Amino acid sequence: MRVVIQRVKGAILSVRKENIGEKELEIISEIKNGLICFLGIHKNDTWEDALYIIRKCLNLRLWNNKTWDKNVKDLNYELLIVSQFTLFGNTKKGNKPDFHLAKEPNEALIFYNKIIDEFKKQYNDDKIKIGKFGNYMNIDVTNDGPVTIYIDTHD
Amino acid sequence: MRVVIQRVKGAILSVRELEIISEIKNGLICFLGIHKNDTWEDALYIIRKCLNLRLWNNDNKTWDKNVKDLNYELLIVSQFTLFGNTKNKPDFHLAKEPNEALIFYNKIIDEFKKQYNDDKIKIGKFGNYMNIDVTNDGPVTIYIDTHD
């Protein structure tokens, strides 16, 4: 699994609606302070992989007080989790990507939902927010720092 | 070197109540992490990629047109946190010394404009606390580490 974590003052998630027909976007999800986590599910991902993310994600002490002191949970903040397979975007070949290691949607989707459930269990039902899986989204992020964290659980 | 690339409809970079210093419409935002043992070949690879990766569709032809093809902007922001050791409080052992990093960074930015266009590259205020309003278009998130 791969995650890019962005510390934010807020985030506003929209998706393109299905039968649109003469607005095309729709805000389905919003958070104030907290993290936005772009989550890449690898084909060979185990649930132990998920656990690790869900942990570092809810636990890294990414805010000051002393520096790098409190985590998202401590401050009672939100997380927005967005599935992003482009992480597994291989770009060593041509100057055009290639997403072969990216766990195929229908399996990925379930794994994903399972992760999101765990998040709420470990934290709070009201603090975890998501996008619309596999749909084109439009995200307004207000980066606070910035603070960008990358994790690859195949290390 | 490490880069996180985000495809965007726009972004506004500001510093300290808030001063706008840098803004782009469609294009990429590149969070750049300069490694201590970074060579200029590392810089080059990044620059080649941010500038040539085809991250936009030709309605249906997905991954067809790169940033230049569409005459779009890039916003480059130094971000050392990419080299955070998270194996549960961060550890930036591997970053390149600031005073050195800054020069390397400016050198990279120059290259960007050379390879592309003076008017298409935008940046932040190095080492300062910034506030960035990104509008992610997808999203499309790309990660690269030249140490591969």
Swiss-Prot record, chain B:
Tell me yes or no: is RNA-binding among this UniProt entry's keywords: yes
Known outcome of mutating S78A = Partial loss of deacylation of D-tyrosyl-tRNA(Tyr)
Q: Which UniProt keywords apply?
A: Cytoplasm, Hydrolase, Nucleotide-binding, RNA-binding, tRNA-binding
Position of sequence motif C-terminal adenosine nucleotide of tRNA: 93-96
Pfam families the record matches:
Tyr_Deacylase
What does the record give as the reaction this protein catalyses? Answer: glycyl-tRNA(Ala) + H2O = tRNA(Ala) + glycine + H(+); a D-aminoacyl-tRNA + H2O = a tRNA + a D-alpha-amino acid + H(+); D-tyrosyl-tRNA(Tyr) + H2O = D-tyrosine + tRNA(Tyr)
Q: Where is the active site?
A: T81
Which residues of the sequence carry a binding annotation for tRNA? W63, F80
GO BP field: tRNA metabolic process
GO CC, any one term? cytoplasm
Q: Where can the motif Gly-cisPro motif, allows the protein to recognize chirality of D-amino acids be found?
A: 138-139
* EC top class named in words: hydrolase
Subcellular localization is given as: Cytoplasm
Q: Name the consequence of A101F.
A: Loss of deacylation of D-tyrosyl-tRNA(Tyr), loss of deacylation of glycyl-tRNA(Gly), not toxic upon overexpression
Write down the SUPFAM superfamilies for this protein, in alphabetical order. Answer: DTD-like
Q: Kindly list the GO molecular function terms attached to this UniProt entry.
A: D-tyrosyl-tRNA(Tyr) deacylase activity; Gly-tRNA(Ala) deacylase activity; nucleotide binding; tRNA binding
Primary residence: cytoplasm
- The EC number(s) attached to this protein equal 3.1.1.96
Cite the effect that the entry attributes to F126A.
Loss of deacylation of D-tyrosyl-tRNA(Tyr), loss of deacylation of glycyl-tRNA(Gly)
Question: Cross-referenced NCBIfam families, in alphabetical order?
Answer: D-aminoacyl-tRNA deacylase (TIGR00256)
> Domain comment text?
A Gly-cisPro motif from one monomer fits into the active site of the other monomer to allow specific chiral rejection of L-amino acids.
- Miscellaneous: In the crystal structures with bound ADP (PDB 3KO4, 3KO5), the adenosine moiety is thought to represent the authentic C-terminal adenosine of charged tRNA and is annotated as such in this entry.
Q: Which family does it belong to?
A: Belongs to the DTD family.
Name the job this protein performs. D-aminoacyl-tRNA deacylase, with no observable activity on tRNAs charged with their cognate L-amino acid. Probably acts by rejecting L-amino acids from its binding site rather than specific recognition of D-amino acids. Catalyzes the hydrolysis of D-tyrosyl-tRNA(Tyr), has no activity on correctly charged L-tyrosyl-tRNA(Tyr). Hydrolyzes correctly charged, achiral, glycyl-tRNA(Gly). Deacylates mischarged D.melanogaster and E.coli glycyl-tRNA(Ala). Probably acts via tRNA-based rather than protein-based catalysis.
Assembly and oligomerization: Homodimer.
Give the protein's recorded name.
D-aminoacyl-tRNA deacylase
Q: Which organism is it from?
A: Plasmodium falciparum (isolate 3D7)
Q: Which gene encodes it?
A: DTD
